[PDB]
Amino acid sequence: FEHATTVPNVPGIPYKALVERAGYAPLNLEITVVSSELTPSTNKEYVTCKFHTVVPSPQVKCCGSLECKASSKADYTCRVFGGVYPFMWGGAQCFCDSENTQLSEAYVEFAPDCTIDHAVALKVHTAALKVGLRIVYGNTTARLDTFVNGVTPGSSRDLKVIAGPISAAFSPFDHKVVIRKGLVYNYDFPEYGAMNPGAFGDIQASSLDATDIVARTDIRLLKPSVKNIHVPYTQAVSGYEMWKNNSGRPLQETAPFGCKIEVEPLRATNCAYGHIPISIDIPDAAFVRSSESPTILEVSCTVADCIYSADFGGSLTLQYKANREGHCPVHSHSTTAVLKEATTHVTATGSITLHFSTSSPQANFIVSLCGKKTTCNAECKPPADHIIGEPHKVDQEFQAAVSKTSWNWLLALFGGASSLIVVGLIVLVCSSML
Amino acid sequence: FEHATTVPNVPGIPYKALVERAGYAPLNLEITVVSSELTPSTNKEYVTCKFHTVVPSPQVKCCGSLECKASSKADYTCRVFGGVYPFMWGGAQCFCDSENTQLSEAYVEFAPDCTIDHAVALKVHTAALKVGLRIVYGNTTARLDTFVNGVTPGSSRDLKVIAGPISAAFSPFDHKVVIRKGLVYNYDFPEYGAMNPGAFGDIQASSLDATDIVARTDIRLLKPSVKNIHVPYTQAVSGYEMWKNNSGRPLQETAPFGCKIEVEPLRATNCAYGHIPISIDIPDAAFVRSSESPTILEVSCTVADCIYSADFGGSLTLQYKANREGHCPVHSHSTTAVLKEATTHVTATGSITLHFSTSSPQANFIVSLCGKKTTCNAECKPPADHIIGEPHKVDQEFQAAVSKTSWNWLLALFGGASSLIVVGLIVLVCSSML
Numbered sequence: 001f002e003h004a005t006t007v008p009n010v011p012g013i014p015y016k017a018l019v020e021r022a023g024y025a026p027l028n029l030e031i032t033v034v035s036s037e038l039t040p041s042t043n044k045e046y047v048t049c050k051f052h053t054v055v056p057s058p059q060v061k062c063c064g065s066l067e068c069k070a071s072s073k074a075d076y077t078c079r080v081f082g083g084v085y086p087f088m089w090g091g092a093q094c095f096c097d098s099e100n101t102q103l104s105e106a107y108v109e110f111a112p113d114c115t116i117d118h119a120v121a122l123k124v125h126t127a128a129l130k131v132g133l134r135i136v137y138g139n140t141t142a143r144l145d146t147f148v149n150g151v152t153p154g155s156s157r158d159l160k161v162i163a164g165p166i167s168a169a170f171s172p173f174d175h176k177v178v179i180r181k182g183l184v185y186n187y188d189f190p191e192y193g194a195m196n197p198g199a200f201g202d203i204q205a206s207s208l209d210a211t212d213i214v215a216r217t218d219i220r221l222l223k224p225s226v227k228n229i230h231v232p233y234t235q236a237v238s239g240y241e242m243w244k245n246n247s248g249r250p251l252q253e254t255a256p257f258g259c260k261i262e263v264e265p266l267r268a269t270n271c272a273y274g275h276i277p278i279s280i281d282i283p284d285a286a287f288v289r290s291s292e293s294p295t296i297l298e299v300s301c302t303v304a305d306c307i308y309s310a311d312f313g314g315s316l317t318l319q320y321k322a323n324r325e326g327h328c329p330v331h332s333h334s335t336t337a338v339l340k341e342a343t344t345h346v347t348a349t350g351s352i353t354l355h356f357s358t359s360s361p362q363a364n365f366i367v368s369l370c371g372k373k374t375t376c377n378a379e380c381k382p383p384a385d386h387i388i389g390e391p392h393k394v395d396q397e398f399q400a401a402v403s404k405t406s407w408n409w410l411l412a413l414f415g416g417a418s419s420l421i422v423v424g425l426i427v428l429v430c431s432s433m434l
Numbered sequence: 435f436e437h438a439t440t441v442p443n444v445p446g447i448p449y450k451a452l453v454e455r456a457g458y459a460p461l462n463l464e465i466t467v468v469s470s471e472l473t474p475s476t477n478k479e480y481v482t483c484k485f486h487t488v489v490p491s492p493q494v495k496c497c498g499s500l501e502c503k504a505s506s507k508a509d510y511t512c513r514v515f516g517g518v519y520p521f522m523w524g525g526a527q528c529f530c531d532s533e534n535t536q537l538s539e540a541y542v543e544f545a546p547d548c549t550i551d552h553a554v555a556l557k558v559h560t561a562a563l564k565v566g567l568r569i570v571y572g573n574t575t576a577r578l579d580t581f582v583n584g585v586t587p588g589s590s591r592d593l594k595v596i597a598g599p600i601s602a603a604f605s606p607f608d609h610k611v612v613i614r615k616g617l618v619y620n621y622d623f624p625e626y627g628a629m630n631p632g633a634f635g636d637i638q639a640s641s642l643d644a645t646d647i648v649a650r651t652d653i654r655l656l657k658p659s660v661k662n663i664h665v666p667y668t669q670a671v672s673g674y675e676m677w678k679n680n681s682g683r684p685l686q687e688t689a690p691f692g693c694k695i696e697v698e699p700l701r702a703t704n705c706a707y708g709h710i711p712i713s714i715d716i717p718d719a720a721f722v723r724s725s726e727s728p729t730i731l732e733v734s735c736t737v738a739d740c741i742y743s744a745d746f747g748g749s750l751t752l753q754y755k756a757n758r759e760g761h762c763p764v765h766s767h768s769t770t771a772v773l774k775e776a777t778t779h780v781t782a783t784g785s786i787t788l789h790f791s792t793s794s795p796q797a798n799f800i801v802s803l804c805g806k807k808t809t810c811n812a813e814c815k816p817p818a819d820h821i822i823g824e825p826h827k828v829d830q831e832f833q834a835a836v837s838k839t840s841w842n843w844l845l846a847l848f849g850g851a852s853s854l855i856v857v858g859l860i861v862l863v864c865s866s867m868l
């Protein structure tokens with residue numbers, strides 16, 4: 001037998017269902033989303049960190065003018081100064097006091113402590129959720145991990161589970177993200193080659209140890225104003241440091257739908273943003289014949305102090321009478337109230353209490369003790385507590401959320417208005433035929 | 435100096451331009467696309483090959499029965515055979531001739547030659563184009579590589595050029611591709627875990643050496659008929675070899691805009707499909723003063739035997755009245771005709787010749803001989819050769835594709851009909867005032 005149903009993406013919060021077969025007994029169906037993960041397909045655009053702005057020794061030639069050729073090093077800024085008189089310790093460094101040439105060289109490199117402190121720029125594509133499911137059908141508890149794609153038959157034991165395509169995906173990661181020390185940022189980093197100075201991506205490379213290092217940080221070499229040797233240079237502030245100053249908050253503190261963000265690999269776990277269409281191929285071994293199932297005669301609901309809340313507020317007792325011994329499932333067919341229990345060992349002519357939760361002010365739903373569908377009615381008071389530490393077990397649907405007294409009052413006013421309108425029109429009609 | 439232009443994406447057939455400042459004279463601009471490549475972002479979604487379907491030794495236990503536990507091996511299928519009596523060399527194997535048990539196991543595994551004969555199933559996303567550009571200005575020729583995103587400063591030794599966003603990338607690779615032995619295919623392979631027997635992807639892994647191999651080939655174990663110790667099994671045929679049977683043609687042979695597909699990395703080179711906006715910053719070291727540039731006083735043009743074709747057919751001769759020896763550029767200011775040469779040596783009051791190609795029967799265009807403009811008129815013939823081995827240097831527009839003689843006849847008829855209608859209406863006007 002194949003049962004196709006729809007489960008909310010909330011972690012925990014067990015989902016009830018009834019499996020009714022024409023040739024077998026109804027079966028309790030439990031579906032719990034124990035965990036989920038939204039893993040995007042990512043690629044490494046580049047990696048960046050603080051630079052080193054290492055400066056080589058100046059090249060001095062005296063009565064001779066020399067030029068410097070191009071180099072493949074990042075930020076290869078090279079300047080030529082004439083008329084310099086270099087002077088280290090001991091004495092003047094050379095001769096030709098009026099005619100010299102000092103060559104000053106500058107090029108950036110990754111800082112030595114960039115193996116730890118480095119930001120990797122990733123491009124994020126579409127993400128496919130992988131859901132961890134637990135099914136407690138017919139005293140058989142199967143734990144499985146399956147992909148939400150609609151084509152993958154991934155399940156354990158003889159059970160088979162296909163999770164259909166998700167109702168809607170929101171992609172918490174933007175198309176460009178930045179990962180640093182386990183922190184994820186939705187930052188629009190510049191592309192490879194596109195390199196603003198003094199901001200993020202000022203120095204780039206394909207890998208940390210890659211020799212193809214590129215940068216466009218503004219290095220300006222200046223003429224030495226003191227009669228010594230050195231390379232005076234003005235440089236833009238490190239854009240990695242400026243980004244770390246103004247990084248904002250990581251995605252772990254701003255992800256919608258309560259997504260908990262991890263890296264290696266990048267993923268969003270324990271999200272809740274929609275409904276999974278799931279098809280389950282239940283084995284025939286767990287199914288029990290209707291002849292062996294106790295066919296129950298008559299039941300009735302009597303509710304005791306129901307409170308509509310996120311908690312299991314409300315305990316109703318069922319008055320039943322059954323032909324023989326044996327257990328049978330319980331289920332609430334309405335999508336408004338949920339029942340805590342799933343199987344009771346009913347015996348004969350007694351009463352069993354069950355705790356239930358609901359959201360609507362009025363509790364009209366269907367209890368299916370041994371499959372005996374019975375409509376149950378109750379009046380529930382608003383909860384006294386304001387904030388609760390556990391999530392709601394059912395979503396409002398805005399048709400039963402209107403209370404019975406309010407429903408009756410609205411239909412009373414519209415019925416009275418329509419009645420006076422119709423009697424006005426029929427007075428017009430009978431005056432017209434006169 | 436920022437010059438904005440829009441060059442064709444076609445490799446070869448170089449693009450001519452004239453850059454003219456207010457006061458630093460005209461200068462040539464020779465923009466050549468020597469190479470291009472589309473390198474899309476891909477991720478390994480699985481790898482597949484033939485399976486070995488290694489069958490382990492049977493486990494025969496007697497005077498009893500045993501069951502086998504499920505394993506994590508790829509496509510594990512195990513069965514229990516009752517009432518066997520094996521005969522390998524030496525006679526019967528054990529006691530309870532009527533009560534025996536044979537345990538048969540079967541699982542698949544990559545073939546020993548899967549290191550080469552393997553198909554990598556990849557998901558492909560949007561691609562970024564990268565151009566090799568040969569830019570000639572003055573006497574300087576520079577070769578330089580630029581990404582096509584409008585943001586990346588592709589630079590020569592001294593040049594700053596930006597390749598703007600492409601008109602419309604066509605993406606020859608679909609969302610799913612398969613790479614085998616250097617041949618790529620646009621194949622809609624099943625996802626991870628979505629195995630089916632007798633089709634591509636029936637065995638899957640993240641790598642050739644990955645232990646987590648999963649497969650769902652239709653394998654079944656059968657009861658042995660002859661009383662020996664073999665394991666009779668029957669399995670569905672390998673969908674890898676079935677896919678190689680009818681893979682169709684690779685993308686190297688079936689690709690729009692006819693461009694060469696390579697692997698490692700997966701790229702599409704020399705794809706002529708559009709127009710690249712180019713904003714180039716010409717250095718001022720080549721912008722000569724207008725006074726030093728030898729200007730001309732009187733310019734006249736003629737043309738002999740214009741043949742419109744992809745080849746540079748047509749010789750156009752200019753009579754000039756220059757005042758100084760030197761050289762200065764030439765350019766055609768029509769999108770319909772393009773000149774062969776860029777700069778011409780000019781002495782004084784002489785005659786020069788140029789070659790050009792056009793796609794219109796009429797050649798009504800503008801030659802800018804060394805600063806100023808001069809119009810030229812012609813009537814070009816269709817070429818004798820039906821097929822030429824080189825692409826066209828210009829496109830076709832509806833205004834130029836109609837010949838001057840045909841333009842005359844068509845407007846002669848249209849204007850005759852229109853003026854005939856207007857003269858009918860004015861005869862109506864003079865009759866109505868009567």
Ligand SMILES: *[C@@H]1O[C@H](CO)[C@@H](O)[C@H](O)[C@H]1NC(C)=O
Pocket residue numbers: 138139327
């Ligand atoms: C299912 O579980 C209940 C509670 O443990 C047990 O008493 C009952 O016999 C079980 N039903 C079957 C059919 O095994």
Ligand SMILES: *[C@@H]1O[C@H](CO)[C@@H](O)[C@H](O)[C@H]1NC(C)=O
Pocket residue numbers: 245246
């Ligand atoms: C950024 O740096 C400035 C100093 O320039 C400092 O005052 C400030 O706290 C830093 N952080 C933010 C978020 O502005």
Ligand SMILES: *[C@@H]1O[C@H](CO)[C@@H](O)[C@H](O)[C@H]1NC(C)=O
Pocket residue numbers: 572573722761
């Ligand atoms: C370019 O070269 C020509 C001849 O090749 C020479 O006469 C001239 O000096 C050069 N002009 C410029 C502007 O570089």
Ligand SMILES: *[C@@H]1O[C@H](CO)[C@@H](O)[C@H](O)[C@H]1NC(C)=O
Pocket residue numbers: 679680
């Ligand atoms: C497929 O393999 C069969 C052999 O069974 C062969 O006859 C046939 O030509 C192959 N190709 C196609 C397209 O069927």
